[PDB]
């Protein structure tokens with residue numbers, strides 16, 4: 251069985267389980283079941299399944315070098331699939347709630363979930379809660395007797411909290427820390443003093459890397475009973491790196507990829523986001539460039555956004571991106587090498603993760 | 611040590627733990643820590659702590675009849691407190707997100723969290739996510755080596771999902787099931803055919819009773835290692851009953867308690883809620899009363915709301931409430947008696963729960 255086709259099959263099985271259970275134990279009626287079925291498919295399907303598929307890929311890696319009965323190979327692949335879906339549904343939770351929080355319009359060239367006419371914000375916030383609750387229902391059901399149940403639940407729990415903390419860093423990244431105050435409406439920064447590499451890095455680490463890279467890799471290890479083939483500090487460091495890199499790409503695209511091909515109109519400029527472009531631009535601007543940036547950043551007005559785009563264009567950020575790229579390629583090879591020591595196989599899995607990131 | 615004073619002390623300890631950990635492991639800065647501290651206090655403190663205190667009360671009950679070292683008594687009380695806070699913070703999650711979902715204005719005579727000037731919806735949806743994540747951080751920290759860890763986490767997980775399912779029933783309770791459709795904007799019901807006792811009962815069971823009555827009682831049992839003193843089907847049935855009754859009270863108050871003393875302007879009429887008043891009114895109206903109700907229900911216009919209030923006034927719903935009240939008092943005494951058999955002590959704890967509900 252090919253990996254993707256196994257993964258998608260397990261979706262159908264997990265969906266049927268969750269919906270059947272709503273009927274038999276939660277007194278749901280057909281039409282509400284259909285609503286939740288459509289919600290699940292619209293929010294969970296349609297991307298590349300990179301995160302879910304990484305758990306499958308890590309487990310397939312260990313399968314090739316570990317002696318197992320066939321039924322045991324099958325159980326581990328099924329566990330890897332269910333695990334991947336947990337991460338997919340965790341992401342779906344985050345995307346639904348984030349889209350509502352940020353007033354987004356589109357995602358994947360389709361409307362955000364809350365903007366569907368029969369959904370609305372009132373239902374969508376709760377739908378996003380259900381998506382995450384489903385991750386736990388899956389885990390307690392499929393993994394109830396598994397030796398890795400507690401470690402998986404505990405990891406999932408930490409990643410989720412880290413992500414929510416990351417979200418908070420992200421949404422507050424245009425404020426001056428010393429002005430945060432629930433009693434007082436928050437002005438956008440005027441000095442941009444908090445637009446630094448280290449601050450940028452902290453947003454991306456919490457907001458993205460833990461759920462996008464750390465979780466899928468470590469879940470792979472957990473379902474394979476293989477956490478002893480690795481140095482968990484290395485896995486963290488390599489995930490950090492690749493994750494930060496992933497975000498730098500998506501920050502460049504928010505600004506420069508055509509809307510049709512992005513799946514979204516980008517608004518990082520107008521939301522006054524601590525993007526890599528803004529940080530890197532401020533790291534090399536002269537005084538007159540900094541005043542012009544400040545006059546035009548974080549304003550809805552299209553003329554002012556066109557000015558920020560102009561400033562980045564003439565800043566030769568491509569040179570900074572190539573230099574950043576070169577250093578990440580450098581460091582990730584070092585970490586892959588250090589991971590070769592204990593696990594050739596895991597290190598290959600991280601290699602493949604790195605490749606699928608380094609392209610798109 | 612008095613119970614409340616123990617419970618509130620444990621708040622301070624859990625808050626310090628969660629905030630200290632954000633600093634030492636999540637790279638948080640002081641001002642974001644202060645924001646989350648204010649968020650925690652504004653969303654978690656200020657009510658009666660009925661749910662949290664029930665876990666403490668159930669555990670104190672078993673303490674009086676079970677032989678333990680003093681340090682063991684202390685650990686169980688501390689576990690009961692932490693457990694109660696988990697339920698409190700779960701509720702705080704639900705209240706923050708619900709207030710946003712329903713466009714609420716006030717709660718407890720203070721503004722809803724999302725309406726604080728320095729918060730906004732963008733942050734508040736994520737703050738509510740953090741509140742629930744905190745429940746898990748608490749459990750894995752304080753209960754890491756406890757024999758009841760898995761059963762507590764698994765119960766908490768089910769209650770939370772049930773609640774979210776309940777929320778969905780509640781928000782969709784003015785729609786015709788056969789018209790639910792994410793593609794199509796949802797019209798309010800015209801026939802009110804789904805405003806029945808059984809449908810009402812289903813909303814309340816999922817939305818309220820599991821988290822308000824079931825969870826605190828069973829958590830009490832879990833931290834006391836006492837789940838074998840009870841017939842879990844009885845605990846469920848008694849919780850169902852008392853919980854349904856609790857909601858009937860709050861449905862009567864939404865309509866009739868002065869706003870100042872309620873802590874809220876009631877909007878159940880204008881939100882076209884499946885309240886007990888509406889269901890019970892439709893259960894005894896004549897044809898002309900039903901047409902007038904239908905002309906005026908679920909409309910913001912104050913004149914039309916005053917008309918629905920008038921209809922309930924002249925319907926003699928007090929007689930239906932006294933009859934419902936009498937039957938609940940009846941059935942709960944039966945269940946308390948059936949619970950006396952295995953646990954005199956638990957049954958007393960359910961008695962006290964019943965009393966604090968039956969008044970206010």
Ligand SMILES: O=C1CN(C(=O)C2CCCC2)CCN1
Pocket residue numbers: 405408409412460635636637
């Ligand atoms: O730098 C860090 C690392 N931490 C972890 O790895 C937790 C979160 C994700 C899995 C366990 C704590 C947060 N900050």
Ligand SMILES: O=C1CN(C(=O)C2CCCC2)CCN1
Pocket residue numbers: 275276277765768769772820
């Ligand atoms: O009628 C029911 C009963 N159920 C439970 O008791 C689950 C949820 C709360 C604790 C376990 C399943 C849902 N419906």
Ligand SMILES: [Zn+2]
Pocket residue numbers: 348349351352420
């Ligand atoms: Zn966002």
Ligand SMILES: [Zn+2]
Pocket residue numbers: 500501504
């Ligand atoms: Zn982006």
Ligand SMILES: [Zn+2]
Pocket residue numbers: 708709711712780
């Ligand atoms: Zn509500």
Ligand SMILES: [Zn+2]
Pocket residue numbers: 860861864
């Ligand atoms: Zn109410």
